[PDB]
């Protein structure tokens, strides 16, 4: 097996989980310890369904930037025995463009799904169904409903979380390592 296929499959196995909230089916990225990230639209409650059981959420933080603008990411600390393999070394320090990225979706409806989205560019401001959002990136690929939370990855780097599309293009919230600092 090649290096990029091995990396994506290991990310799926060790870090990318099928979840359900009251808003429906989403992909969740576990980053380290009991810390995971969700797309804000998932609106996690006091418990979240993770793969095969209900998990209590100890803390949730909806991230905003220094202006108070939505970044469309929710950090959650889970009450679970699982400790996530620490992938913070694979998250860039600054929001980074990439060539020939893959979007990895994992929900009950779209399990272990690989989508060849192509180049990912800096985008910035996005109006997400009436909610203004900063620090987004863009791919010229017609993504569809049900892929929110999907993980954007390129050459061993974990660079974004899918947050929506316009029928011709898809958009992610950019990841940076400091979001996950202790």
**How far apart are the C-alpha atoms of 73 and 178, rounded to whole Å?**
13
- State this model's resolution in angstroms: 1.5
- Full 3-state SS string of 89-133: HHCCCCCCCEEEEEEEECCCCCCCEEEEEEEEEEEEEEEECCEEE
Which residue is associated with the tokens 């699982």? Answer: 82
**How far apart are the C-alpha atoms of 44 and 58, rounded to whole Å?**
11
Where are the chain's structural domains?
A: 1-15+85-182, 16-84
**How far apart are the C-alpha atoms of 16 and 109, rounded to whole Å?**
14
Which residue among 51, 62, 108, 148 is the active-site one? 148
Q: Which two tokens stand for residue 75?
A: 């950090």
Q: Does the annotation count 108 as an active-site position?
A: no
**Which residue, 150, 107, 166, 181, is CA-closest to 8?**
150
Q: Does the annotation count 148 as an active-site position?
A: yes
Q: Does the annotation count 25 as an active-site position?
A: no
């Amino acid at each position: 097996m090649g290096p990029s296929l091995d990396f994506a499959l290991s990310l799926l196995r060790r870090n990318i989980r099928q979840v359900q909230t009251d808003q429906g089916h989403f992909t969740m990225l576990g980053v380290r310890d009991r810390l995971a990230v969700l797309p804000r639209h998932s609106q996690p409650g006091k418990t979240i369904w993770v793969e095969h059981k209900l998990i209590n959420i100890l803390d949730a933080v909806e991230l905003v930037d220094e202006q108070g603008v939505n970044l469309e990411l929710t950090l959650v600390t889970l009450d679970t025995n699982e400790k996530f393999r620490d992938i913070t070394k694979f998250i860039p320090e600054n929001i980074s463009a990439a060539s020939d990225a893959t979007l990895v979706i994992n929900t009950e409806h779209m399990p272990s799904m690989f989508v060849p989205v192509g180049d990912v560019v800096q985008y910035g401001f996005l109006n997400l169904s009436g909610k203004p959002t900063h620090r987004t990136m863009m791919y010229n690929f017609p993504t569809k409903a049900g892929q929110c939370g999907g993980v954007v990855t390129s050459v061993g780097k974990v660079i974004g979380i899918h947050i929506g599309g316009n029928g011709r293009q898809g958009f992610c919230a950019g990841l940076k390592r400091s979001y996950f600092a202790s």
